[PDB]
RNA sequence: UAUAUAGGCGUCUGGGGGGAACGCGGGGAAGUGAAACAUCUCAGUACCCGUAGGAAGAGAAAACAAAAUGUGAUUCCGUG
RNA sequence: CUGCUGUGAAUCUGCCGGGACCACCCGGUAAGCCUGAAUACUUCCCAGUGACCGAUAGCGGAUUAGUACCGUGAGGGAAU
RNA sequence: AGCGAAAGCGAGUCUGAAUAGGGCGUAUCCACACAAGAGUGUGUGGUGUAGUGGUGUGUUCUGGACCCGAAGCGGAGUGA
RNA sequence: CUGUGGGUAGGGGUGAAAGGCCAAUCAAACUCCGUGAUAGCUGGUUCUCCCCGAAAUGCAUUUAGGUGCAGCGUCGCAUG
RNA sequence: AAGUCCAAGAGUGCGGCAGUGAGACGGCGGGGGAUAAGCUCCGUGCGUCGAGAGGGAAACAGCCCAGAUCGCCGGCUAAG
RNA sequence: AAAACACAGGUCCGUGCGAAGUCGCAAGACGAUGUAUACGGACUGACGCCUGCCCGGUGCUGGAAGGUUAAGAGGACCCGUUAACUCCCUUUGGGGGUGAAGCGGAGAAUUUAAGCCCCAGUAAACGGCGGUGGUAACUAUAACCAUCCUAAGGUAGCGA
RNA sequence: UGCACUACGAGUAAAGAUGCUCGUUACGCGCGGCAGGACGAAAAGACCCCGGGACCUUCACUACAACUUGGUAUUGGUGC
RNA sequence: UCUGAUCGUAUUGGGCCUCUAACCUCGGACCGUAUAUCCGGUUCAGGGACAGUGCCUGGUGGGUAGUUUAACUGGGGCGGUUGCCUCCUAAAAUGUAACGGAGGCGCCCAAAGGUUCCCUCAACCUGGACGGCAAUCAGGUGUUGAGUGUAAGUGCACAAGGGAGCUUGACUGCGAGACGGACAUGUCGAGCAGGGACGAAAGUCGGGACUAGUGAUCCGGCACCUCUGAGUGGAAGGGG
């Protein structure tokens, strides 16, 4: 009902974060701006 | 008969230049989602083994 | 019979860790609490779990500001 | 044995890394020791260092610049640290890596 | 059952069994330890089988090492 | 490296070994052998040794000793 | 001679784009300065760092492991 | 019913079945060996005196009559 | 800030060696019990026994006095 | 020493005969110098009256079409190294993309057994063998009213 | 069979005393008897619990002995 | 010959009927052999390419074997419990037991996080339409009495409670001096690149008012890495 989701950077496709959403409340792949360390700037991060 | 070294201790502990026995902290292998990065950093790296366990760790490492 | 009780959490060892007059480094935990029984005072900060710690060094001083017990750090002049 | 609870040699993680079977390790001698052993300077090879008792007899010698160099030395070691080479040159000597 | 054979007759030559240890080749436990236990250990131990000899097995690299005009059968010690 | 089961190659532009495969590169020419010394042991014999025992010790056995005795037996097994 | 997981570098090293701080090391101690009073640092200059072989002793490791004691387990045999 | 001579043997025999009998022992005989099995258990552990001197708590524990570490003793150093 | 300070034979740190980890009763504070138990579980820079002789409670580990270095056929006392 | 075992009698099951079963690694043996009116096994236990219902669970005995289903030479694809292709720097050589022959991996489609799933039997196989409650069920009672659930509801007989 | 010139009552005590307290009783030593005590002897309680065994059971686990598949030795003219 | 019904050969396959030669027969007769229900040679008669066991393979498998079948526990069993959080026990620091008294927890968050800025909630009428105890938004009155996502507390009205704007501070990467700390887990993060807004300047944030919402190590997965790569090149594998 709330899986461990892995957010990856859209630019480098580095799996950077592991959060938990609710698959029901927010079924769509989560999109939030966080910075990959290797990129440096906050870039859009999406579920794997 | 040579004194055999404990393999597990040999693999989990190390000595520094001065001789301090160092170890990595537990709770950093898996189930890392909920752990705040502050806890993960606190657990990161090596620390000297506590004085209480220093004796038995040294005995296991020497023989 | 059988009692439905028998449980209790591990005591968290709360309370004041530095009392008024104790000199502390910049960062020492002055109090541990669940709410804000003590509110942070001058050069005292409040942490995530409501821990009062010293933002600056010096002696702890318990006071009251507007009917709220407060923990302050008064600087200690180097002699 | 620790009473049956997970021992300290099992509840702690194994230290990270590998030992690198092929690691090339150097017996090191510092330029301060070069000074102390050779106040006269001169050619200082692995044989000279071993004779003066600064490195093991059959080993890859490396030179490090920890002390201070004040004499002309023609050192010859498998490798030289940057500081060791710099001090060897500054003292009017030469650092032939061989 | 026919060239032809299993076998039968006669003669020489050997074998048989014992032996404490060591050898080689096979089979191969369990108590035990793992503070339980099965992997594992015990242990290739005990025991068992087959076999030698004064010794035996291995032995003269289609080897090992790594760029050294490297060593050059095996075995056995010390180290590693 | 090896056992049992199948499948099963070429003979030097061959084949192995380098802990899978290469312009590779090195080691070289297996699938048949015999080979002393260095090594292990002491039933037995000889000459010695002991900061070994000294008759409840030392071999079980200084005398009858694997005897007497016990057990159907394997076996156990003294005392002096 | 350490740091690190090694290309490794080396009185430094690891972490880190980030001379950002920390970890671990540079025996120890003394003086000089520069700094900051966040608990002291930074360099500079001094004396120069102490292991390692026997061996005693106490613990300890592998062995029977201070000594005695099971019921039971295994191997090979003996018994109707 | 019984004599004599036989046969069946240990995870096996035999059992008009009692788990009975299998050499005064049988819910797996006996002897030797593994073997000085192992036992968190019980017992025992031998001369003296001088100094100090506990603990029976905490945590954890396939743990609760065991053990690890801490607490408390002692002996060395260091601070004083 | 003093006191104790030719000592408490103190505190702290690091090492060698531990033993202990079954506690008992008494006073006080409490839980369980019936605000029974010589009950049970806690707290107590509380005590004593444990590990403590001596005097008193008659006898009587835990109560009161009092902590035995030895010898006196000396004296003063504690509880009583 | 019995109420237990056995027993003669019964029933079921197995067995086409170096049988089944058993001792054996095996050979061989017993069974049996026997032959289905014989053997082995299970239960019951003379004899007499009888052994009523149930094959749902589990065994056994047959198999209904499927599905699942190891061991293989079914070996797509993919992956390693590279003869070689292309291009960048850079030019007395290393940076990407494509990459045959091969040899070396991991290997999917497809592929057929038993068993399982599944259908029918089997209770002298292990085992099962209720309610209603509306009746006069007779108010000693066996059926009857017509009722839910399974596979069925304990039939005769006996019973402190 | 630790002792011994081994009383009784009420007590106290590890809560059932020949051995301790305060009393009571009792000349020493035997002999024949009886069995109330010495928590009498016997057998390191067969109960209970804990630890460990063994054997037994089973839709406990893991194995192993006892049935199907592939090709191997089985084998082909012309077959479908 | 390209989509393509049929091609005839040779190679190799699932299956059915078989020809006998493998192999089998405790079916017969012979001979070794005077003795012989042994066995093994010949032969005949049957099976037959099955069966048999060999290797590998699936199933059934207490038939046998080795084992495991927890502790606490006012004896043991039955029952109950075992980890975490909150309270009282708990003797005004910390801590403190019982099979003591009570409850919660193995979650919810993409907003219920961050940040800026605003607001206060209960309880009664002058009074109201269907409108009642309770709706309204009736503020008209009334002093912080409700509400905190969720147990309990400690807090919160200054708000931590109620609203909106933007946004993704789980600064993720690097990390202060410090501290909470039998051995195995927590509080601030002052600084750094890169952010978030609101804005306007100043400004604050390392998920939540706080303490539960979790599981060491070992083993392996999966991504990225300027790490190693058993002669060298890669590769496998390993490492971070």
Curated annotation (Swiss-Prot), chain A:
Query: InterPro entries annotated for this entry?
Result: Ribosomal_bL33, Ribosomal_bL33_CS, Ribosomal_bL33_sf, Ribosomal_zn-bd
Q: Per UniProt, which keywords does this protein have? A: Ribonucleoprotein, Ribosomal protein
Provide the GO biological process annotations. translation
CC annotations in GO? cytoplasm; ribonucleoprotein complex; ribosome
Which Gene3D superfamilies does the UniProt entry name for this protein? Ribosomal protein L33 (2.20.28.120)
> Per its record, what are the GO molecular function terms?
structural constituent of ribosome
| Family membership | Belongs to the bacterial ribosomal protein bL33 family.
HAMAP family (UniProt xref)? Ribosomal_bL33
In its UniProt entry, what is this protein called?
A: Large ribosomal subunit protein bL33A
Q: Which organism is it from?
A: Mycolicibacterium smegmatis (strain ATCC 700084 / mc(2)155)
Curated annotation (Swiss-Prot), chain B:
Cite the InterPro entries for this sequence: Ribosomal_bL35, Ribosomal_bL35-like, Ribosomal_bL35_CS, Ribosomal_bL35_sf
Query: A Gene Ontology molecular-function term?
Result: structural constituent of ribosome
Record-level GO cellular component terms: cytosolic large ribosomal subunit
Q: According to the UniProt entry, which residue ranges have a biased composition of type Basic residues?
A: 1-41
Sorted keywords for this record are: Ribonucleoprotein, Ribosomal protein
**Which GO BP terms apply?**
translation
Q: Tell me the segments the record calls region Disordered.
A: 1-63
Looking up Pfam families in the UniProt record yields:
Ribosomal_L35p
Q: Where is the composition biased (Polar residues)?
A: 47-57
NCBIfam families for this protein: rpmI_bact
Which family does the record claim for this protein?
Belongs to the bacterial ribosomal protein bL35 family.
PANTHER family linked to this entry: 54S RIBOSOMAL PROTEIN BL35M (PTHR33343), LARGE RIBOSOMAL SUBUNIT PROTEIN BL35M (PTHR33343:SF1)
Name of the featured protein: Large ribosomal subunit protein bL35
Q: What's the source species' lineage?
A: Bacteria, Bacillati, Actinomycetota, Actinomycetes, Mycobacteriales
UniProtKB/Swiss-Prot annotation, chain C:
Record keywords: Ribonucleoprotein included?
Answer: yes
Q: Which Pfam families match?
A: Ribosomal_L27
* GO cellular component terms, semicolon-separated: cytosolic large ribosomal subunit
Gene3D superfamilies membership: 2.40.50.100
State if Ribosomal protein is listed as a keyword.
Answer: yes
Q: Which UniProt keywords apply?
A: Ribonucleoprotein, Ribosomal protein
Molecular functions (GO terms): structural constituent of ribosome
- UniProt GO BP: translation
The signal peptide, as residue positions, is none
Q: Which family does it belong to?
A: Belongs to the bacterial ribosomal protein bL27 family.
Can you name this protein? Large ribosomal subunit protein bL27
Taxonomic path:
Bacteria, Bacillati, Actinomycetota, Actinomycetes, Mycobacteriales
